[PDB]
């Protein structure tokens, strides 16, 4: 059953470029590919993807995401590609990528990563520990996630240049 707002075909659901503020209701639980890119989604509901356990690809890029719910991707153990670039994200919740055991590609660039704040540390460590997973606008690029203002690579940020008071 396709959601009203979207196009469907086999296991792909294209909800892209539809001016959406949140994830549409009624995505079949058999869905493997979910395009949500080019919308105006600011917040995801906690658990919004918990039923979509078969997702192998998810595009969330080019929205207005400011914050991600903790455990938003915890049930997505078949995800190979996740796109999060070109949002308003300042950090990744601690542990948020840990269950993504099938990941081959993630896009992180064009976000205001806030490297002054201590929440950036999970992301900094995660990128450093997964040097072949992060892609920029072209090819493989672990430095493409860049601190707002200073434009230095997130993966370079360590505990001593951060503070818990800046979050």
């Amino acid at each position: 059953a396709c959601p009203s707002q979207c196009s469907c075909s086999g296991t792909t659901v294209d909800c892209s470029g539809k001016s959406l503020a949140s994830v549409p209701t009624g995505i079949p639980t058999t869905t493997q590919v979910l395009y949500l890119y080019d919308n105006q989604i600011t917040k995801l509901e906690p658990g919004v993807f918990d039923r979509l356990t078969q997702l192998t690809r998810l595009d969330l890029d080019n929205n207005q995401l400011t914050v991600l719910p903790a455990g938003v991707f915890d049930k997505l153990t078949q995800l190979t590609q996740l796109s999060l670039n070109d949002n308003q994200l300042k950090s990744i919740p601690r542990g948020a990528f840990d269950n993504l055991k099938s990941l081959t590609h993630i896009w992180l660039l064009n976000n205001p990563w806030d490297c002054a704040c201590s929440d950036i540390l999970y992301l900094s460590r995660w990128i450093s520990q997964h040097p072949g997973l992060v892609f920029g606008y072209l090819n493989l690029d672990p430095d493409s996630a860049r601190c707002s203002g200073t434009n230095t690579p997130v993966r370079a940020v360590t505990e001593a240049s951060t503070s818990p008071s800046k979050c």
Binding site: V33, D38, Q81, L109, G136, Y137, L138, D141, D143
Partner: protein, 126 residues
């Protein structure tokens, strides 16, 4: 078409790459050298299902249409085959888009091999 260095420098200048967004001509020549070795028909299939095309190896996930990259965008509004032309016009127009939407930091080989060097060497004798 495989360009010579000066031949490519000459064509990049007349397309207006010299000092585009503050990058001197030699930067773009140095980029294209490490991306394609000056060969407009360089092609590279990526693991995500995209392909890289042309002298600056522009990707079909974001920038051009090849009709075989699923969920891809066409931010430059061009067929990826236009990026294979002996006419560098489409590859220059797409590159300019990339520098603005992203700058040259998108080209990792340029960042590591070209950036901060005497890059006007790429331009000597042209």
């Amino acid at each position: 078409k495989v360009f010579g260095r000066c031949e490519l420098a000459a064509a990049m200048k007349r397309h207006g790459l010299d000092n585009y967004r503050g990058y001197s001509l030699g930067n773009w020549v140095c980029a294209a050298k490490f991306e394609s070795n000056f060969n407009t028909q360089a092609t590279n299939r990526n693991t995500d299902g995209s392909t890289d095309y042309g002298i600056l190896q522009i990707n079909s996930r974001w920038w051009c249409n090849d009709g075989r990259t699923p969920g891809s965008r066409n931010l430059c509004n061009i067929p990826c085959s236009a990026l294979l032309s002996s006419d560098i016009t489409a590859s220059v127009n797409c590159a300019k888009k990339i520098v603005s939407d992203g700058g040259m930091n998108a080209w990792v080989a340029w960042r590591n091999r070209c950036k901060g060097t005497d890059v006007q060497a790429w331009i000597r004798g042209c």
